[PDB]
Symmetry: D2
Subunit: 726 residues, 4 copies
């Protein structure tokens, strides 16, 4: 027995806060958390405890430490079938990664509608508020490989597999409401431009290079989603604190055949929250797995990610009532014109057991719809429908990818398809064709109907010639980028300017920078001027005379486009660094932990070494990490209790902890003699907004700190941080 006698190798199978215990496969951490999909996977789940180690053929292995050789210092023998089986499997472990969205993190959960939607769709999973649908959700970046970092600047994917009683419905969306391009024919062009450049395969996980901004400067249709990527939307704090969008206009079809246009939305119950660029970039180095880890640990703690599904609904007769084309995926539908109507709630409440088998092998595809839904002529969606089926033939090894366990429907499936690589289902049907008499034509077609009916496309009218031709209605590129820009707060606008500025400074060919700035001048001249000055570029008289695009149906601002104009952050599930010393004032720590617990805010106790320190009252404090091992990047706020402050007052890592937190706009609280640290962050004796201070951590101290946390970051501090060397 190699496990420690005290059983400390095994995490408790109950919810525990981040860092308290080692993480674990979901079936071991939360065995009582069940749903119909999780239950259906039991046939393929493999145990381990009390089993003998065997080959894949079931032969018990006596010595898993040695190859078979002629003498114990001799050559290895070809007849060692145990060695060759073990190494052969190792040698073939890897499969192709996803062409895009290769980096991602996934969890199990369930969805429930608030009310029956039978009046607008016959989709069974939306038919009854008591009907629970299991889901599997994968969040992702777009550009980088499966081994790339989480907190990059990028669009994020938000893919949901609904295992409904009438088939699998995949809602395959992103965290912004539009995409970069209009027609799917250009997807390889755009993706090649953003991906690592082909001669040297640089840069990973970044749009900050020549070919991306070359394409952008020549394809102004990209400018709307570029604006979103350059905002703090491109660097979310957590998959739990971003929105999701289906982007395309789809259709809802009801039992009477009536079609309603719909765009899909996910709204996070934890609110919207993002990092700042310097923090996000440094965090890809200090913890490239930050979002994967934060998602997994939130679920292990009971901080289940929750999202509200919502519909923007447009009747068929309103198709042409907007300044933009509903079928153009570079255009958003402003919520001020078409509100998001709440539909239901999705809870993610259990992690996978095996990342590769469940996450890496999962296959989502927006062509997977169910009766009650349909497509539109959106020309980006139209080409998507080809790609997601085609790409699985190489990525997952052939056409039986629906038999990979995570991908299997939980409802029945029967047809006349046969064979293919790794075929699992053994069909007993005498017939493999229809029409047939020898099996009385089973399985049989089903007419469409109000429930449990066959799928039939909505019979929309098609008229025109066969043409490769962009719709003229799509030929407008600046008004929605302007609407987004003018919907942001002044500090969000600064971060957008600084996003463009940072990225264009990495473009080696200066004329590309100049051409992008010219595009910006067609959107908004305050933005263009601010970027140009960071690039040493002077706008011309003609550029300063470019007429701005008009409002979007009278809108200059839509409040739903800003992350922060109306703060909506829940503090539950956030985390606070507590900087210890070797004789902490226990009365301070008591008040701190009392208040954090009451708000569901987690804490990590940090010090200059691991092990334990003893407080002034004799309490033994276990150390979660060192100052350098868990940097301020990984937390939302910092608190310094009183005690033997001299122990850490001269510690360079402790002082830098506060300076980095200060620079990144995080709330900081200093008790007692810890107020001496104000000098390090250049805070005057009188204090300033965003720095909590008092003689001791009391009731009022922690209310002030948690109020700051509710507002996410201290935006008023921005004018001071450029003088801070951090």
């Amino acid at each position: 027995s190699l496990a420690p006698e005290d059983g400390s190798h095994r995490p408790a199978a109950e919810p525990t806060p981040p860092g308290a215990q080692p993480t674990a496969p979901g079936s071991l951490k939360a065995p009582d958390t069940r749903n119909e999909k999780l239950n259906s996977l039991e046939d393929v789940r493999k145990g381990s405890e009390n089993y003998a180690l065997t080959t894949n053929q079931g032969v018990r292995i006596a010595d898993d430490q040695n190859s078979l050789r002629a003498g114990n210092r001799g050559p290895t023998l070809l007849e060692d079938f145990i060695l060759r089986e073990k190494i052969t499997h190792f040698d073939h472990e890897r499969i192709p990664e996803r062409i895009v969205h290769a980096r991602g993190s996934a969890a199990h959960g369930y969805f429930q509608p608030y009310k029956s939607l039978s009046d607008i769709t016959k989709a069974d999973f939306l038919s009854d508020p008591n009907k629970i649908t299991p889901v599997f959700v994968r969040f992702s970046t777009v550009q980088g490989g499966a081994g790339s970092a989480d907190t990059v600047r990028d669009i994020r994917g938000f893919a949901t597999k609904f295992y409904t009683e009438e088939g699998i419905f995949d809602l395959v969306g992103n965290n912004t409401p539009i995409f970069f391009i209009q027609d799917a024919h250009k997807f390889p062009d755009f993706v090649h431009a953003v991906k690592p450049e082909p001669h040297w395969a640089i840069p990973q996980g970044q749009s900050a290079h020549d070919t991306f901004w070359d394409y952008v400067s020549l394809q102004p249709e990209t400018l709307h989603n570029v604006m979103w990527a350059m905002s703090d939307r491109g660097i979310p704090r957590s998959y739990r604190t971003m929105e999701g969008f289906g982007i395309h206009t789809f259709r809802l079809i009801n039992a009477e055949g009536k079609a309603t246009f719909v765009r899909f939305h996910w709204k996070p119950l934890a609110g919207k929250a993002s990092l700042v660029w310097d923090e996000a970039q440094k965090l890809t180095g200090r913890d490239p797995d930050f979002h994967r880890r934060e998602l997994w640990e939130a679920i292990e703690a009971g901080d289940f990610p929750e999202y509200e599904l919502g519909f923007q609904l447009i009747p068929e007769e309103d198709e042409f009532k907007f300044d933009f084309d509903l079928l153009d995926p570079t255009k958003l539908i402003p919520e001020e014109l078409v509100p998001v109507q709440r539909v239901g709630k999705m809870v993610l409440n259990r992690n996978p057991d095996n990342f590769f088998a469940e996450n890496e092998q999962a296959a989502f595809h927006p062509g997977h719809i169910v009766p009650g839904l349909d497509f539109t002529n959106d020309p980006l969606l139209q080409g998507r429908l080809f790609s997601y089926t085609d790409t699985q033939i190489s990525r997952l090894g052939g056409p039986n990818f629906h038999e990979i366990p995570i991908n299997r429907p939980t409802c029945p499936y029967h047809n006349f398809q046969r064979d293919g690589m790794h075929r699992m289902g053994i069909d007993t049907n005498p017939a493999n064709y229809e029409p047939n008499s020898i099996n009385d034509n089973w399985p049989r077609e089903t007419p469409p109907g109000p429930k449990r009916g066959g799928f039939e496309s909505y019979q929309e009218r098609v008229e025109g010639n066969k043409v490769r031709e962009r719709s003229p209605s799509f030929g407008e590129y600046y008004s929605h980028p302007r609407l987004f820009w003018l919907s942001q707060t002044p500090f969000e606008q600064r971060h957008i300017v600084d996003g463009f500025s940072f990225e264009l400074s990495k473009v080696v060919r200066p004329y590309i920078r100049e051409r992008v700035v010219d595009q910006l001048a067609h959107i908004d001249l305050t933005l263009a001027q601010a970027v140009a000055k960071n690039l040493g570029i002077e706008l011309t008289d003609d550029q300063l005379n470019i007429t701005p695009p008009p409002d979007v149906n009278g809108l200059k601002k839509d409040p739903s486009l800003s992350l922060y104009a109306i703060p909506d952050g829940d503090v539950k599930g956030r985390v606070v660094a507590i900087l210890l010393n070797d004789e902490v004032r226990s009365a301070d720590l008591l008040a701190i932990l009392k208040a954090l617990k009451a708000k569901g805010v987690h804490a990590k106790l940090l010090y200059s070494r691991m092990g334990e320190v003893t407080a002034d009252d004799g309490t033994v404090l276990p150390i979660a990490a060192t100052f350098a091992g868990a940097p301020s990047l990984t937390v939302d706020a910092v608190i310094v209790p009183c005690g033997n402050i001299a122990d850490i007052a001269d510690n360079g890592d402790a002082n830098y902890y506060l300076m980095e937190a200060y620079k990144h706009l995080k709330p900081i609280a200093l008790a007692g003699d810890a107020r001496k640290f104000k000098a390090t962050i250049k805070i005057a004796d009188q204090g300033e907004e965003g720095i909590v201070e008092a003689d001791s951590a009391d009731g009022s101290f922690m209310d002030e700190l948690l109020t700051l946390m509710a507002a996410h970051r201290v935006w008023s501090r921005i004018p001071k941080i450029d003088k801070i060397p951090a």
Copy 2:
């Protein structure tokens, strides 16, 4: 609903004779035939009756007759996901065929030992006479593709997968006791030589071409298995009427660690029986699926193929007591020297449900042994051990081929292997490595022991230098071919001569023919002279002075090497053609069917058209096939009952039916006026051996016929038919 009103489209779930009803998947035909392996496949079996037709994602299909198009005479739309899924799966149905043995037919069954063998092997499946082991068996040819013909002249494969309680054991044998080559390094050379030639990919299923006999003439080690292939061994009547052999010397290991050398044997309880060449070749045209069909119908009839497993056992100390090397796979062990000791019986009693899923994807490999068995230094076996693992990576699409349902062990299997294409098992082990503490080192190694122990190789001595060198003890090539030749009956010797002569006549380069005849002169000069005469080659004086090779340990013959020298026929499961007329004597037919039923012999009612005829007593007789639809090639004997013989007496197909049956040495029985057909085959008034005749089909009539059938063929007829125009 498209089935006939009378519900007659479905075969009965009961044993029925060949051709009576449509064949069916094994689960429908015999649902009460069960074993542990068949039962374990129920997780992946799919039904069909009373289910809706769906996509692979579970969406019900309304119209499986049409593509989605813009207008009913317009272009097909990319958004038709139902069409594209269906065509995508069709487009990727095929997987690589096996490099060799691509043509094969398989069935389920079970094995049982007669008595515990624990005195000589600790293998669990041989430890207890009440231990039932499920098997899956695949028979095959070698050279031809998966769509080539069954009754070619070739070696046959005989592979048995044992699903034992201590792991999968694959016994991967052929139907002759030796192979063509000594060292696995030459296998691609030999296989390329026998396969279709690389410029034009001709000929399929035939060794009768230049490159095969080129290789043979230059590699005399091949001559022994060539002898077997040129005998009637190369054209079996049925997979049920041939022997099986493991070929290699293996080892049995008992609980005290003693090693016994062993060669494995399968003896057919239906006896040994082969076709003749003209019949076998024409049958590849009239029914290329004859062996596959015959096996399937025998099982549906309850004529379960049975085979006795036997062991040739040689003590370790007798390794060098023979004239030949025990580890040389071109040498057989004469049963006159080492008898085959009976071990157990295998019964094949159920067909698969889906050929592709169960047959095409099954993976056998002789490196799949279990504790109680081990290898030897046989250099052909040694290289086999590398091949069977390697080849599955492309054939079955990755390293998880053991998770394909037919390949799965029924015993537990757990290890630290992970991922790979189409990974099915979802591991919950916190550890994917050992030694580990975090899962207390589970799954754990098992020390070797008398039962349920871990695998450990027999610690045989290895001594010598690293050399690419053939053992000198392998360098004798003619003694065993000569022993085989001398052990055959005179008519079997004639058929060997005719095999060589026919094949070498299809060799275009005459010098190759001459070099092969020269090799034959080193085996036996009678054989060489007879083949040379058929090729217009005259032996030289030097060739006529070649000394014959020595006897094999004093043996002048070994009758176990002949198909027919020692009678072992068994008529159960054979088939007789009954040639009908439009008013058959019901008394003849009554006595015929009665007598066949008492011996388990089946009958096929044939006529000049399909439909029905009525006997003289009003019995309506359904017709199974026409004379040309089911030629005499497909049956073991022919009976012509009395009645309105004028109806068929001038029918050309009926007359040729008897001429073909006569040429191929099959018993024929003629009742009453059917004796007019004696004129067609030139039988004398007084009769001849092999022709049954009487005033009526009485009981003595049928006893003579069934006695002939038990002798398989009428060998005394050969000189008569050597001049038959048929």
Copy 3:
């Protein structure tokens, strides 16, 4: 060394009648028969005479008769990279066969127009009678596997790859002027019905079984091509003596933008000729390679297959 002294191992590099000499790879039988496509393949052609036997990495092999073992009667060693490379390549020789038309025989040649067709099409390979276009043609059956027999009753495929100056044009036709079904959505149903039945994978190369005629009886659109299949059209004497059809109506587009509907035809210069059924069936047994052999030997004899 191993060749006979009289040189009779090697066929003459000039036309010879069927059976007179061993058949050979085309570059060795007819080294002076060229076209632009055949020449463009010289970069990947590999010789053999006077070269050393090597691994795929270029290492010369001294002993290609034996595995490396510990003693000449010992176990084979894992370090034998020459053995493992040779067996690995053999172990992975096969690729998936075509879903349909898996059985097929092919040759090189060229195409030339009789006159300019600029009035009705701007296709460059039809622009004038001096446009020489290399082709590669594959004839096939439909139902059987790659190792099935040639002279089955079946439809035949007739596929031509034109290597034109403005891109590849594949004319993928059959030897009858229609197909069995109207809408591609039904293709897996029809093909599954004619193919070997899924429980036992019987019969090979034959429509003569229940599921095919079940489908036919329930889908009368199939009856026209069934009539052709049941006629002697279904058992051609040679790929040289059958017609070819593109089946579909396509379009020709000229330089002025005018569209003309077109159906494509191949007419055999050797005339139309078919077997009779008893002969065709027995011949699948006596020589399952008859059509492949006959095509190859015709070309080696100089009886070049020609089609208008």
Copy 4:
């Protein structure tokens, strides 16, 4: 075989030898080399046994393993000297 899609990975340009290579190996996925050898096996007479084995020698010779001594029993055992 999985990473590069089959046994012809030596035909991918960067992997190709710059020296000659000839043997009797055939087919495999994405096979680039078109072999004109009448034979795909050795020993053969129909191509006078080309390409031919080469004896080991001081230069341009065939590969032959060093004939080091092997002595022991077939064991799965670590050498004590490694401990």
